[PDB]
Amino acid sequence: MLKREMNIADYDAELWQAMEQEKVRQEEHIELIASENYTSPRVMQAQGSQLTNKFAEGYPGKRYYGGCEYVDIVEQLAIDRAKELFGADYANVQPHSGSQANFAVYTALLEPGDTVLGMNLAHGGHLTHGSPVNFSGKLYNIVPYGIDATGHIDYADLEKQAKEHKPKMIIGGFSAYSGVVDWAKMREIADSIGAYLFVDMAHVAGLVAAGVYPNPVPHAHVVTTTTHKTLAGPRGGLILAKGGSEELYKKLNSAVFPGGQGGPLMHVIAGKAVALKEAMEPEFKTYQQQVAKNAKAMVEVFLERGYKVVSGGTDNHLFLVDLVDKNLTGKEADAALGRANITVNKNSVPNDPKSPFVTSGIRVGTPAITRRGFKEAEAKELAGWMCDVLDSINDEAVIERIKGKVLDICARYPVYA
Amino acid sequence: MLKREMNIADYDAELWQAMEQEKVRQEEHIELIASENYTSPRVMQAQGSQLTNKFAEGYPGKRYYGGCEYVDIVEQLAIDRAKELFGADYANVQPHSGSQANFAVYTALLEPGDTVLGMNLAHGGHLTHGSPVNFSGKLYNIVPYGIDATGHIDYADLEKQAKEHKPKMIIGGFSAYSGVVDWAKMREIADSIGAYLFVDMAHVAGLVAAGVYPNPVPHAHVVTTTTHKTLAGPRGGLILAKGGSEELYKKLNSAVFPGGQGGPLMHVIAGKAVALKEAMEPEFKTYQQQVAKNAKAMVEVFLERGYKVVSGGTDNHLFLVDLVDKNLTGKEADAALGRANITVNKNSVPNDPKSPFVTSGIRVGTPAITRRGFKEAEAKELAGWMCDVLDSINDEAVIERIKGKVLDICARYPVYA
Ligand SMILES: *Cc1c(COP(=O)(O)O)cnc(C)c1O
Ligand SMILES: *Cc1c(COP(=O)(O)O)cnc(C)c1O
């Protein structure tokens, strides 16, 4: 039946039409939506490989069915590289998503109905970290802890509510506009209660990978991350652990399979193995340093133009722009910048007068533009254009003026050259 | 950074080595492991597309973030084709796996701790259908129902245990060696108790797609399936429903997102849309008829050679070979046929004297060989070779004799020509 050509575009016309229109969009839009990144052509071509036909159920070396003698090596490379890169003695590259990566931890260490002191969803919290609409909040009792006025973690507030409710696990996952997390302090608090320390570094994986952001793995029980964000990866999940007992490692192993999922996607795992090797390169370090370098350069521009930035400056690669004083909503800023081909997302400010859906502020990330080839001089130029739109918010002529400059710089700096 | 070449093999040597060794294996091994199939090059090339960079969270037409104007069309094509093909007015192509596809149904319609009358795991039952090691059995109370001696469903036994325990949902998923399921009878039983009717046709999706196997969708509440088995698809899940209320459709919609998973894999969904179009072709029908035609031809050979086949003959594309009378174990039959490059899996027989891990029998499927180009004359030849190995089970010369013939027929009939 299979003649080994069937080009995606001689059979299905309308699907290819929509496929290439998205390709044009990505080549003509500035992506400043937080922690979104472009992946390697090595990953793409490994993801679209013949390994999608292979059904391997279980773990390498101890599979159920025969003929898994070669795919065990493919997965082991992804495991061994994950261990060496983040300095862990445990790695799991089978979870389909970051939501599934977290799901395993809850089913392994927690009973249905246990008190979990997770980060507040209303103030930058993740869905899998405790949400009424998510499985995490429905099955488990969630008691939220809040951050301080600037955005940094109140360590005295975390020590409280710990004796009041006595949680079995505390979630110290990274959220928006928050600075560095003292994970050494997290362990001291968790040990006094007798609770598990769970840290989700999904958002800041690439920065820890190069050595720009502190590593939570050395002093945490279970650490989860996405392989497709600040690490430039296939879309998936990862479970890492350091300094634990083998009886606790097999808890997480059983939590993935046969916990919540069946056979892992080997074509994605092949893309995971190559992506980790690219992160080990010295060229990945210079890129990741330039990500934080561009983030700082942008904050300088917004402050000089009279726009308030949360926490004064940026710690990593994310910064939130306050628009309360300018009397503008984040929904109106999103649509205005969206028309000028600048992709930003609306975000709620601390002490927001307006609806959490109207947001009165915007969130800007820098990993997508740095991957393209934007330097400090290009990052300040783009930040200058954004302020031009925010000044004349309803002037249509100004929006078209910026878009033309955006279309030019996208033509000068392509994603895939 | 990205120079738009980075061939998978000039950077990572050992990964490509393992990748091509699996490609050689698949081209030199006869796959008779049940319901495993080779996918289209259209799917592979759409799975390894630039759509992996796109982050679209939510549902088409009502996304959270801007710039999702084109990916809504990509997903809608996968939805519209899924509806028309299986005759449903509801489709969901976002679930990452069949385990996640089932997970949504349980979280949407059932409370944690509800009595569920699912199929017996010990006798052909699926893991997500009620298993002590799986999330389905841990969160929900599972009461198992068993099949009759031949393998067909005891309808009187299903009517019992329904008043004894009063379940809120009954699972009528397809299992091994079972014939046709009277799904019209399933509805009559479920309505009397006031329970949801959940049918998993994952294993027999392609046969229903062509019109060889009866369709459970017209008379069932919720129907789930994998898009990567007897349908020749990207590895994923699908939720279908027909004749329900909109308040029950939005239960399943919320069950996927923000139920158990975040943003869907758009590169896989693009592969899902093209795979459904290929199933609509008249050439897919003639293939699927030839799948059942080869299954019947093989049973004829095994019966003439004095080997017992469960249920007398095959109903669809799966048949189980009994080896109790021959005094051979399914573990020894697996290893012997495995060395002759025949990939079969060990399976337990009804009333098994030996361990469920030693299995005293084997399970053979026919969708992989039919996809390659095997007809009735080629299917009977292969079945003849299998019996030659089972007759002289410890004779090493015979095993090498068959392998040579297997290597020849694989060279004559390639997967991707
Ligand atoms: C079919 C199947 C699944 C579905 O996902 P796979 O990719 O096929 O693993 C899950 N578990 C079992 C036991 C299956 O047979
Ligand atoms: C990061 C993220 C996830 C992880 O999976 P995606 O593919 O990025 O969707 C899940 N939910 C939310 C809200 C996320 O930000």
CA atoms in the 13 A half-sphere facing the CB of B384 = 8
Burial class of residue B182 in the structure, from the number of CB atoms within 10 Å of its CB (0-12 exposed, 13-18 middle, 19+ buried): middle
Whether the ω angle into residue A258 lies within 30 degrees of 0, i.e. cis, is yes
| Ligand 1 pocket check for A146: Cβ under 6 Å | no
φ/ψ of B330, rounded to 5, equals -70, -20
Q: What torsion, rounded to 10 degrees, do the Cα atoms A349, A361, A293, A180 define? A: 10
Kindly give the distance from the C-alpha atom of residue A55 to the centroid of ligand 1, in angstroms, as a whole number. 8
Handedness of CA B126, B128, B129, B133 (dihedral sign): positive
φ/ψ of B180, rounded to 5, equals -70, 145
Q: Which residues on A lie below 8 Å from B43 (Cβ)?
A: 52
Q: Which residues on B lie below 8 Å from A7 (Cβ)?
A: 45
Whether the ω angle into residue A41 lies within 30 degrees of 0, i.e. cis, is no
Kindly give the distance from the C-alpha atom of residue A226 to the centroid of ligand 2, in angstroms, as a whole number. 8
* CB A206, CB A230: distance < 8 Å: yes
Pick A50's closest partner by Cβ from B7, B26, B69: B26
Residue written as tokens 């893991």? B127
Interface residue B62 vs chain A (CB under 8 A): no
Q: Please give the C-alpha separations between residue A144 and each of A119, B129, B352, in angstroms, as whole numbers.
A: 5, 34, 53
Q: What torsion, rounded to 10 degrees, do the Cα atoms A127, A131, A132, A136 define? A: 90
Rounded Cα gap, residues B256 and B247, in angstroms? 15
* CB B70, CB B382: distance < 8 Å: no
Q: Which residues on B lie below 8 Å from A235 (Cβ)?
A: 52, 265, 267
Rounded Cα gap, residues B409 and A284, in angstroms? 47
> Which residues does A152 contact at the CB level (< 8 Å), separation at least 6?
A178, A179, A311
Taken as a whole, chain A contains a residue count of: 417
* CB B53, CB A26: distance < 8 Å: yes
Interface residue B261 vs chain A (CB under 8 A): yes
Residue written as tokens 């502190």? A214
Q: Which ligand is nearest to the CA of B125?
A: 1
Size of interface A-B (CB pairs under 8 A): 262
Q: Which residues on B lie below 8 Å from A65 (Cβ)?
A: 33, 343, 345
> Which residues does B370 contact at the CB level (< 8 Å), separation at least 6?
B287, B290, B291, B294
Rounded Cα gap, residues A140 and A178, in angstroms? 25
Choice from B33, B200, B226 to test ligand 1 binding pocket (greatest atom count within 8 A of CB): B226
* CB A335, CB B67: distance < 8 Å: no
Q: What is the DSSP string of A140-185?
A: SEE--B---SSSS--HHHHHTTTTTS--SEEE----TT-----HHH
Choice from A31, A97, A203 to test ligand 2 binding pocket (greatest atom count within 8 A of CB): A97
- Hey, are the CB atoms on B2 and A277 less than 8 Å from each other? no
Handedness of CA A227, A229, A232, A233 (dihedral sign): positive
Question: Closest Cα of chain B to A159: distance in Å?
Answer: 30
Rounded Cα gap, residues B191 and B202, in angstroms? 24
Give the β-pairing of B115-117 and A345-346: unpaired
| Ligand 1 pocket check for B235: Cβ under 6 Å | yes
- Hey, are the CB atoms on B70 and A234 less than 8 Å from each other? no
Interface residue A416 vs chain B (CB under 8 A): yes
Pick B19's closest partner by Cβ from A2, A39, A270: A270
Helices B330-339 & B396-412 angle (0-180, nearest 10) = 60
SS3 B257: helix
Name the method of structure determination. Answer: X-ray
CA atoms in the 13 A half-sphere facing the CB of A359 = 19
Interface residue A397 vs chain B (CB under 8 A): no
Interface residue B44 vs chain A (CB under 8 A): yes
Give the β-pairing of B222-226 and B237-241: antiparallel
> Which residues does A381 contact at the CB level (< 8 Å), separation at least 6?
A409
Q: Which sequence spans correspond to the domains of chain B?
A: 40-280, 281-417
Burial class of residue A332 in the structure, from the number of CB atoms within 10 Å of its CB (0-12 exposed, 13-18 middle, 19+ buried): middle
Residue written as tokens 């003695």? A89
What six digits make up the tokens of B259?
A: 């139920």
> Which residues does B60 contact at the CB level (< 8 Å), separation at least 6?
B68, B71, B72, B73, B75, B76, B79
- Hey, are the CB atoms on B42 and A371 less than 8 Å from each other? no
Question: Closest Cα of chain A to B50: distance in Å?
Answer: 7
Question: Closest Cα of chain A to B265: distance in Å?
Answer: 7
Kindly give the distance from the C-alpha atom of residue B264 to the centroid of ligand 2, in angstroms, as a whole number. 9
Chain A CA closest to residue B275: A12
Q: Which ligand is nearest to the CA of B226?
A: 1
Host H or E run for residue A262? none
- Hey, are the CB atoms on B99 and A262 less than 8 Å from each other? yes
- Hey, are the CB atoms on A70 and B267 less than 8 Å from each other? no
* CB B4, CB A41: distance < 8 Å: yes
* CB B304, CB B379: distance < 8 Å: no
Q: Which residues on B lie below 8 Å from A50 (Cβ)?
A: 19, 22-23, 26, 44, 416
Query: Nearest CA to A43 among B368, B233, B61, B50?
Result: B50
Query: Nearest CA to B316 among B373, B255, B363, B265?
Result: B363
* CB A203, CB A229: distance < 8 Å: yes
Query: Strand order in B345-346's β-sheet?
Result: B308-309, B318-322, B361-365, B345-346
Kindly give the distance from the C-alpha atom of residue B99 to the centroid of ligand 1, in angstroms, as a whole number. 7
* CB B224, CB B238: distance < 8 Å: yes
Common-topology check for domains A40-280 and A281-417: no
> Which residues does B235 contact at the CB level (< 8 Å), separation at least 6?
A52, A265, A267, B97, B226, B227, B228, B268
CB proximity under 8 Å: B 318-377 to A: 334-335, 338, 343, 345, 371-373
What are the start-end ranges of the E strands in A208-335? Answer: 222-226, 237-241, 308-309, 318-322
Rounded Cα gap, residues B131 and B217, in angstroms? 25
Amino acid identity, residue A219? H
> Which residues does B294 contact at the CB level (< 8 Å), separation at least 6?
B366, B369, B370, B374, B375, B376, B379
Per CATH, domain A40-280 is 3.40.640.10: yes
φ/ψ of A172, rounded to 5, equals -110, 50
Give the β-pairing of B169-171 and B196-200: parallel
What are the start-end ranges of the E strands in B9-77? Answer: 30-31, 58-59, 62-63
| Ligand 1 pocket check for B96: Cβ under 6 Å | no
- Hey, are the CB atoms on A70 and B25 less than 8 Å from each other? yes
- Hey, are the CB atoms on B1 and A416 less than 8 Å from each other? no
| Ligand 1 pocket check for B97: Cβ under 6 Å | yes
Resolution (A): 3.3
SS3 B141: strand
Query: Nearest CA to A95 among A239, A302, A241, A294?
Result: A239
φ/ψ of A213, rounded to 5, equals -110, 140
Helices B376-391 & B330-339 angle (0-180, nearest 10) = 120
CATH code linked to domain A281-417: 3.90.1150.10
Interface residue B203 vs chain A (CB under 8 A): no
Taken as a whole, chain B contains a residue count of: 417
Amino acid identity, residue B275? A
Kindly give the distance from the C-alpha atom of residue B197 to the centroid of ligand 1, in angstroms, as a whole number. 21
Q: Please give the C-alpha separations between residue B384 and each of B109, B121, B301, in angstroms, as whole numbers.
A: 49, 32, 7
